[PDB]
Amino acid sequence: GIVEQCCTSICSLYQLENYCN
């Protein structure tokens, strides 16, 4: 999930965009 992918390394804006509706 978002925690596993984005709290152990930095997610870019493009990567964060995967969890929008």
Next chain:
Amino acid sequence: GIVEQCCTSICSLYQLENYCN
């Protein structure tokens, strides 16, 4: 500037990207 453009209507990310270095 950024307060005038962005506190009277909603700036998008592309709009905010204008004020980066």
Next chain:
Amino acid sequence: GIVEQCCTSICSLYQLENYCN
């Protein structure tokens, strides 16, 4: 929705708890 109910008056925690999964 949540903006209409909660940005025109103060929602309590119990009120906010309504929008959880």
Next chain:
Amino acid sequence: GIVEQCCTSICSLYQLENYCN
């Protein structure tokens, strides 16, 4: 205090409620 109890493990809402007035 609050730091010792709530920064080494997660305090729930019920636990945080102990530091209200």
Next chain:
Amino acid sequence: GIVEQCCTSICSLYQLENYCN
């Protein structure tokens, strides 16, 4: 109090320092 003084005009740090212990 702090809401009346500081949400109707901008309190400086010295002004905010007034409400510390």
Next chain:
Amino acid sequence: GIVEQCCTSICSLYQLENYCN
């Protein structure tokens, strides 16, 4: 920079004041 000086130990307000314009 600010990260090297202020993310490995706590910078006071006086210290943070060095990065204002």
Next chain:
Amino acid sequence: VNQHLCGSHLVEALYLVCGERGFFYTP
């Protein structure tokens, strides 16, 4: 703008109240 600033606080508050359950936010 008032709406957009208020929404930012709402999602912080849902983050806290919802816990493990999580949430959705739709403007």
Next chain:
Amino acid sequence: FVNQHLCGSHLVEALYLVCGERGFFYTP
């Protein structure tokens, strides 16, 4: 568990911003 709690809070502020009108969901 605490470091994850704090990181999650900044994730949600970032998502709110990135996703705009589309909005988002957050599942810990």
Next chain:
Amino acid sequence: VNQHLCGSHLVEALYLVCGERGFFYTP
């Protein structure tokens, strides 16, 4: 609501300015 959003910034600012001394917040 304006009051309630502003209060959230105030407590962040007291957190910073007060340091080791700490503070109280009463609406």
Next chain:
Amino acid sequence: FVNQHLCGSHLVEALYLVCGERGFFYTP
């Protein structure tokens, strides 16, 4: 000391929210 500084900031936002009209106090 820094991790405690950052955690404390999220504590206070949480307390502000939890305690409402009663308010709160924070002593580091």
Next chain:
Amino acid sequence: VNQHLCGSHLVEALYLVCGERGFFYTP
């Protein structure tokens, strides 16, 4: 006050969008 609260969100948003490049903020 409305301006001062909105500015706080702006700088959080510039922090994110600008990345390694960084930024300046002038009221």
Next chain:
Amino acid sequence: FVNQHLCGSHLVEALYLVCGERGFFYTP
């Protein structure tokens, strides 16, 4: 890299506040 990302976000809120009308700059 993540702990630095989170700390930086609180730095900028602190600078915004400390510097007032003078404003500031942030270079990671």
